[PDB]
């Protein structure tokens, strides 16, 4: 029934992804700053004449509770606006939610978003 | 069996919510700073004579692994102490956990909390 | 099929845990800074002649999408390298993922990691 869509994306794509989501009626979301490691190349930094590799790079995590019937549309909006063609574009996880409660009213399920 | 309770709430309510949870025996939790977007009004900021809307506002995320039988009590404690009547009070997600392991001992399930 | 491994661990153990994971072929992960409360003792701080207890302590959250068949190996790698014997070593949650999408290509499931 309700699903959590969790996307890890490049920080510079947050504005285009969130504008495309709100334009399609998906305004609600929680956003957090994280770091990610993958196949993308780490960054090279210098310290006292030595170079070192930084393997964890800044990323953005977007979390959205949506009804299952909207999952594929949210996925397609995030993919179209987050992809760049280069390694490090990110992932999207779909995780089951067994209950959504709106703190303010106590509404649940679709009435809670 | 084990569930993850994930609550998004106003930052100024973190102390009252966490005191009410520990008073009821729910001490364990992970807390993180996030930003949220919803029906609540964004904030107005000024920069070089122009006003701009900030749509992502500071929120607090609380995560708690609890046994299913305690979920409704944890939900009610968070709702009573996090609600204010105004838009932006937040959400509570209940997500299945298929395994909980305590790093220190290797205990699992209820012995892992 | 696909599972999310989410580990809460001491910040000073992040390097040893992530080196042991990459050495075993598990490079991909998302890392975030959080605070945690549990049975471990809070910290004592002083402010204007008074002492106060800080109950929420810095922790590190590691998230990894893995195929179910690798979950127990990832758990054992995290436990061996994150445990210290003292209270506050952390937890590991295994959460179902119903869909993993690689933003860059649109690949899913095992081809998405
Ligand atoms: N197994 C995994 N679990 C969770 N997050 C992962 C993951 N593998 C990669 N990530 C996140 C962190 C990375 O910074 C981000 C992009 O990963 P990548 O492997 O560098 O590029 P790409 O996804 O384009 O193949 O996705
Ligand atoms: N679909 C969704 N998925 C995840 N988090 C959401 C969500 N909609 C809202 N949120 C989070 C971020 C918001 O800052 C917070 C409160 O949202 P709101 O819509 O502004 O007020 P309210 O929950 O009182 O209706 O909840
Ligand atoms: N019920 C729960 N839900 C989510 N995270 C928890 C939890 N209980 C504890 N934690 C996280 C935050 C803590 O800082 C960390 C370690 O907890 P602890 O109780 O202090 O030590 P230990 O896990 O060694 O028993 O795990
Ligand atoms: Cl965070
Ligand atoms: Cl989750």
What's the rounded Cα separation, in Å, for the pair B87 and B38?
A: 9
Q: Per the structure block, which two tokens stand in for C25?
A: 């072929």
- Could you state, in order of their start, the residue ranges of all structural domains in chain A? 2-111
Q: Which helix H or strand E contains C10, and what residues bound it?
A: none
Residue A13, chain C, CB below 8 Å: the answer is no
Whole-number Å distance between alpha carbons of C57 and C86: 15
Residue B66 to residue B106: CA distance in whole angstroms? 17
Phi, psi for B24 (deg, rounded to 5): -90, 10
- Method by which this entry was solved: X-ray
Strand B29-37 vs strand B57-67: parallel, antiparallel, or unpaired? Answer: antiparallel
User: What H or E segment, with its residue span, contains residue C46?
Assistant: strand C43-47
Domain C2-111, CATH: 3.30.70.120
| Cα gap A78→A85, rounded to integer Å | 14
The β-bridge partners of C93 are B100, C6
First to last CA, chain A: 13
Architecture, CATH, for domain B7-63+73-94: 2-Layer Sandwich (3.30)
Listed residue (C93, A7, C36, C14) closest to B1, CA to CA: C93
Distance CA C57, CA C108 (A): 37
Q: Which residues line ligand 1 (CB under 6 A)?
A: A 8, 36-40, 57, 59, 87-91; C 28-30, 63-65, 102, 104, 113
DSSP code for C108: B
- Start-to-end CA distance of chain B, whole Å, equals 13
Q: In degrees, to the nearest 5, what angle opens at C-alpha C93 toward C-alphas C92 and C97? A: 140
Q: What is the C-alpha separation between C31 and A36, in angstroms, rounded?
A: 6
Q: How far is B49 from chain A, CA to nearest CA, in Å?
A: 23
Proximal ligand: closest to the CA of B103: 3
Location of structure tokens 């949220």: B36
Query: Collapsing DSSP states into helix, strand and coil, what is residue C81?
Result: helix
Taking CB atoms and an 8 Å limit, are A32 and B89 in contact across chains?
A: no
A49 CA distance to ligand 4 middle (Å) = 33
Beta bridge partners of B37: A29
Residue C86 CA, ligand 1 centroid: distance in Å: 32
**What Å resolution does this PDB entry report?**
1.9
CA dist C63 → A56, A75, B82, C42 (Å) = 13, 20, 27, 25
Distance from CA of C87 to the nearest CA of B (A): 7
């Amino acid at each position: 029934h309700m699903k959590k869509v969790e996307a890890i994306i490049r920080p510079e794509r947050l504005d285009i992804v969130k504008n495309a989501l709100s334009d399609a009626g998906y305004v609600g979301m929680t956003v957090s700053e994280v770091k990610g490691r993958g196949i993308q190349g780490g960054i090279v930094e210098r310290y006292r004449g030595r170079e070192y590799i930084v393997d964890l790079l800044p990323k953005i995590k977007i979390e959205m509770a949506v009804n299952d019937e909207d999952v594929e549309k949210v996925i397609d909006i995030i993919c179209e606006n987050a992809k760049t063609g280069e390694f490090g574009d990110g992932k999207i996880f779909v995780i089951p939610i067994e209950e959504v409660v709106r703190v303010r009213t106590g509404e649940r399920g679709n009435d809670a978003i």
